[PDB]
Structure 1
Amino acid sequence: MSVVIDYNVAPPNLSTLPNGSLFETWRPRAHVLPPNGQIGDPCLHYTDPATGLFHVGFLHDGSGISSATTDDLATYQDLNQGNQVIVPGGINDPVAVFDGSVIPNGINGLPTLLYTSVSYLPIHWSIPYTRGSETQSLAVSSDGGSNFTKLDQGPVIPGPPFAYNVTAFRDPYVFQNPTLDSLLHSKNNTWYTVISGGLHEKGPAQFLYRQYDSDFQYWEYLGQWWHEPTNSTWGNGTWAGRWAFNFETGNVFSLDEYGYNPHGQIFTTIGTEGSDLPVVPQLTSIHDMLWVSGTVSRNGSVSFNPNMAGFLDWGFSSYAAAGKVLPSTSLPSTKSGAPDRFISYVWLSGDLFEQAEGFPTNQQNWTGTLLLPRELRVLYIPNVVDNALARESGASWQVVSSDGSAGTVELQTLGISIARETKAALLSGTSFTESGRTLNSSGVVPFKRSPSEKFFVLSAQLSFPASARGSGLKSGFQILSSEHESTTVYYQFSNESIIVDRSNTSAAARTTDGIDSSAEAGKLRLFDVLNGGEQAIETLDLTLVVDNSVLEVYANGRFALSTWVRSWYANSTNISFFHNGVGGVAFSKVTVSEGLYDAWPDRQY
């Protein structure tokens, strides 16, 4: 008949259950992930100029790249029923297909994939590099993006520059930029490529190239346009992790206040591969998902000079972001009236980058997800008090103007928000509000009403008095609660962090190996701000999106922290105010929207 799962009854050791029995247990409904099995790095994204459809791509089951389309940037349709559009086993890629990116209007006016073709394993920053392990090859889709046919020829970039002893040499990211065109005297709308990795005994780098011929055959090397010393860090390591031992999945793009602008300020997103000392062979212990702002100058060779940096996502398991220009002329953007955007999908690895030993993978029969598509833009924070907090250097913001009369500064940083159409679809459920209140004593205060399922958005504002600064205050919410489980998400002034406490999240973590219960944390500074001539600590504008086991925490349009919340019991759906009693907190009216939506309307599961 069936193997019977009752989520009011206690869990077994989940690894004893049949294959596939936990497929729906923790599965999101509003996120990009394959029909089943494993998802790796997103890549390959492109707007098809002929249709306006936006194509998303991702590594799938360690065997190539799968893809789906969206006409609204909310919901998706599988290509090939989820089967890969390109697989390993060719002449150039006999061992593996690694990440690539797409020139949308390329060879023969077709989407043209430049990707890392792998011929030798293992490959890791910590071990000697095997010559020719990573080349860059071309493929073209003549069938609307369902199949990328490999060009019947060798790699267009057969290895790194002469005698370079690389740590890695992969993840080519194609992009256009008129600032680079001007500085390098390139032909207008030249395609550039960055390749990510580093050099042994020197440190991480992006290797920069430009197309030499219109046919994309030859790629002129323009130097290590950005490189950093081995395991160096932005500032003192507080705000933007470390540059660490190797760069991965380098994206390059340019922004203004509204979205993507070719003439805008230049940003990159990168994964950095970190380690404790001594290094453990073939182990990356820290996967930092960073963004970096910088100016580009020339001095013979072009250079990217960082002026601020932060995390695109503070999640331990968050990594490998791939983003793409989405033009205003796209099908989604035409419906929503958006300007040109840069949409980034962050990867949330399902198994601690394959370190989560004993996780019930055969039972779940899927692993990983992408996070919600995110709009990136230049965010301005006005009316900030010109004090030490605002002026700290080596941080994730910079002063772009000042008012000596008012005593204020305008700050600039990277804006991170849920893509507009996806956010609206997330809120299309049924909405209720919980009354605002102030808390001064220690405890958890149940909401009058909680969602009855584990699919909701929670928004609220938290205001703190001057005395919260530098104190032992902890305030936020307790979610996914019942007598056996709870998860707590809170702001903490002592280290200016948002924390997700997962020690009690999962009753399955007590019976089963490989179900991480570590705390997750990210830094967020709330500055001193001036409005109506009154100086206050900035309001914490918190959004929580819970999609079964996927938690995404957003704050103030500039912060994201995402993780796995693998609660077992059907009843673990209650929400409470939380405050540790140190000082006071005022919670606004809290909005809860329940149900989210189905991001995969043409799948049944």
Structure 2
Amino acid sequence: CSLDQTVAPGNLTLCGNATLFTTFRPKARFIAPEGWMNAPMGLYQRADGSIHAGYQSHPKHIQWGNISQGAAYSSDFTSWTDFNGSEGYKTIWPSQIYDIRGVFDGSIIKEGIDGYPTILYTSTSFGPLGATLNEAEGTETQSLAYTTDDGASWIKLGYGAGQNPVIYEWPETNLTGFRDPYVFQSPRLEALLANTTSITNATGDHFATISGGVHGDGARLFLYRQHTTGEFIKWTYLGPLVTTGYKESYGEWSGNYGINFETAGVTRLNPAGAAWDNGSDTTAVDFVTFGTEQGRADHQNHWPLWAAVDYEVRDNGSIEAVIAYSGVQDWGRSYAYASFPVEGYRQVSVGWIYEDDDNVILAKQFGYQGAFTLFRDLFVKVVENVSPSTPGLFEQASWSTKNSTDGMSVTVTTLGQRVVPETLAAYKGNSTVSTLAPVMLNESAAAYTPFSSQPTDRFYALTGSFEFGLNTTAKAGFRVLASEEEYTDIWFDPASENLTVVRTASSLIKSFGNDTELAKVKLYEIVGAESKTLNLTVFVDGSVIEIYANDEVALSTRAYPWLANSTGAGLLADGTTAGDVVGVSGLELWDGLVDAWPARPANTSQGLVWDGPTAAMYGLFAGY
């Protein structure tokens, strides 16, 4: 095939394996060296302060299978180094009857077996596995392994009675799933349960949730408690923590709860970050983050959600997490968010961005699939002095409201997300930074106005503050990865409250997805203000477009323009007039970002392989 990016693309399906390896590939973020990746796993801050990140991995293939933990480490979330051992960059792989079908997601007990960091993970064996299939007990169990070398290798507990797997009995019949154990400490839950520990005999300092659901009756998050402090074999089932209905939706701001949960976690946050109080901090909020499946017509039937919850203690010594309000962690092509504690009272979240090639047309030509999102600090976002005339404000859909004593202003609380400052500092410092003059978008505004400085490649960031009239019908935003013939348009339309990514012209290559992305964004109007403001930040990284609005709304998507010069960026304006003006300020472009994998050459493909005719016989993995 021809790789001439100055002319229209040919038939790229004729290209060899990994011939398009560098063409669309992110450079400034976490990604496997090659092949298939999906969910983050095994995330923890090591004793030396560095971050260990695992991920679901299938090297030398471009579909899921033999799923293993690949791993790497970083001192700043931003520049990474691969582990290299006897299995390359893998550190846990299928090896025993109980996990031979896949080492699924798992999470870290920092002070575990013999004092070592310990992973509790879903060990899978044979049989139908899935929320739409007739799964049986044993197919998904939960197992332990520990590391004596800070994540370079893991030792599994032995197979058998009183050893691995450590959790195998289904807590209810007819489960849709039983996976993704999330281990956490919780002074809050310990305080709530302290008066009931005689009922259950579970007194350990670690809790674990397991994600699943019940056939025909919606998703479930099951809560376990470590039976005894310092002992890791026995985990006592308390009860369902979160119970939702079959394809239940809390509404337009909240996705859909589907039929089954995946990768659920539990945290507690306050306005500064992570909160480790027992309930005494009145500014702190309990949150659950979770994926749902089969409640969405597109995006691989997957919603990455979160909910604020109020805990109630049941008479049998378990906890009901009652949903107070419910939102979306990312509105685009991402899923499988994991969060973990970081020193300085932080909780950091990261997810997986899948490709937009669902028919698997150019995956072999790429030689890889998937990347992470950026790493995000979670916190309680608080907006003070909100005007009660903010449209829709008292729906309290994915936020809560608290009136002032006099009823004239409102305090809004919701989940905040922002890129970790280490990454922003490194990006800015390594980039060519252009601080741009403010622009009034009025009757003279073109549909597209290129920035006065332009990117030089597909690795850049941009930010801007868009000030709108309170009754505007104008739209504005950013165009990125743009030439005359290919471009991706990011619009906000305050009248509809919709942030969209229009991808009809994103690429000349017709096999990639081109559906319009959509997020809801609430501009909380401030008392006394005669305008409302959207702070919009965009990261462009190969084919990833990752959008953040108001440290609250995130939308990750993909664009694969063919032409070498489809790298431009600028401002979008629609329906701006002399009377309906959009003021854009705080404009800045960072060109270049950071080389996130400095030790890797440009092409880390090792080729692709086929599992052969037995893949279809076993029926577990696609085989390629």
- Taking structure 1 as the reference length, the TM-score comes to 0.90
Please state whether the residue corresponding to 2:131 is helix, strand or coil.
coil
Please state whether the residue corresponding to 1:362 is helix, strand or coil.
helix
Alignment partner for residue 557 of structure 1, among 530, 551, 554? 551
In structure 2, distance between residues paired with 1:97 and 1:358 = 24
- 1:219 aligns to 2:235 (yes or no): yes
- 1:260 aligns to 2:274 (yes or no): yes
Deviation at 1:492, TM superposition (A): 1.3
- 1:568 aligns to 2:562 (yes or no): yes
Q: Following superposition of structure 1 onto structure 2, how do residues 199-598 of structure 1 map, counting pairs within 5 Å?
A: 199-213=214-228, 214-234=230-250, 237-263=251-277, 264-275=284-295, 285-300=300-315, 301-315=318-332, 317-327=333-343, 339-351=344-356, 356-387=358-389, 389=391, 391-402=393-404, 404=406, 407-428=408-429, 429-441=431-443, 443-468=447-472, 471=473, 473-509=474-510, 513=511, 515-530=512-527, 534-581=528-575, 583-598=580-595
In structure 1, distance between residues paired with 2:447 and 2:405 = 42
Name 1:170's counterpart in structure 2. 179
Deviation at 1:296, TM superposition (A): 1.0
Task: Work out whether residues 403 and 409 of structure 1, in 8 Å CA contact, stay in contact via their aligned partners in 2.
Answer: no
Task: Work out whether residues 390 and 524 of structure 2, in 8 Å CA contact, stay in contact via their aligned partners in 1.
Answer: no
Task: Work out whether residues 457 and 592 of structure 1, in 8 Å CA contact, stay in contact via their aligned partners in 2.
Answer: yes
The one-letter code matched in structure 2 to 1:347 is W
Unaligned runs of 5+ in 1: 278-282, 328-338
Task: Work out whether residues 271 and 319 of structure 1, in 8 Å CA contact, stay in contact via their aligned partners in 2.
Answer: yes
Deviation at 1:266, TM superposition (A): 1.2
Calculate percent identity across the aligned residue pairs: 35
Indicate the larger mover: 475-484 or 120-129: 120-129
Deviation at 1:391, TM superposition (A): 3.4
In structure 2, distance between residues paired with 1:99 and 1:276 = 22
Q: Following superposition of structure 1 onto structure 2, how do residues 31-50 of structure 1 map, counting pairs within 5 Å?
A: 31-49=29-47
In structure 1, distance between residues paired with 2:360 and 2:119 = 36
Name 2:205's counterpart in structure 1. 190
The one-letter code matched in structure 1 to 2:92 is I
Unaligned runs of 5+ in 2: 59-64, 278-283, 603-624
Deviation at 1:28, TM superposition (A): 0.9
In structure 2, distance between residues paired with 1:304 and 1:497 = 30
Name 1:159's counterpart in structure 2. 169
Paired residues, what number?
568
In structure 1, distance between residues paired with 2:589 and 2:273 = 28
Task: Work out whether residues 239 and 394 of structure 1, in 8 Å CA contact, stay in contact via their aligned partners in 2.
Answer: no
CA 109–240 in structure 1, closer or farther in 2 if over 3 Å, else same: same
Deviation at 1:540, TM superposition (A): 0.5
Q: Following superposition of structure 1 onto structure 2, how do residues 72-87 of structure 1 map, counting pairs within 5 Å?
A: 72-80=76-84, 83-87=89-93
- Taking structure 2 as the reference length, the TM-score comes to 0.88
The one-letter code matched in structure 2 to 1:149 is I
In structure 2, distance between residues paired with 1:75 and 1:105 = 26
Please state whether the residue corresponding to 2:192 is helix, strand or coil.
helix
Deviation at 1:351, TM superposition (A): 4.8
Indicate the larger mover: 146-155 or 409-418: 146-155
The one-letter code matched in structure 2 to 1:98 is F
Task: Work out whether residues 256 and 296 of structure 2, in 8 Å CA contact, stay in contact via their aligned partners in 1.
Answer: no
Deviation at 1:99, TM superposition (A): 0.7
The one-letter code matched in structure 2 to 1:64 is S
The one-letter code matched in structure 2 to 1:247 is F
In structure 2, distance between residues paired with 1:431 and 1:491 = 25
Deviation at 1:136, TM superposition (A): 0.5
Name 1:334's counterpart in structure 2. none
Please state whether the residue corresponding to 1:262 is helix, strand or coil.
coil
Indicate the larger mover: 20-29 or 145-154: 145-154
In structure 1, distance between residues paired with 2:101 and 2:567 = 45
Runs of 4+ in 1 over 4 A off after TM superposition: 186-189
CA 538–115 in structure 1, closer or farther in 2 if over 3 Å, else same: same
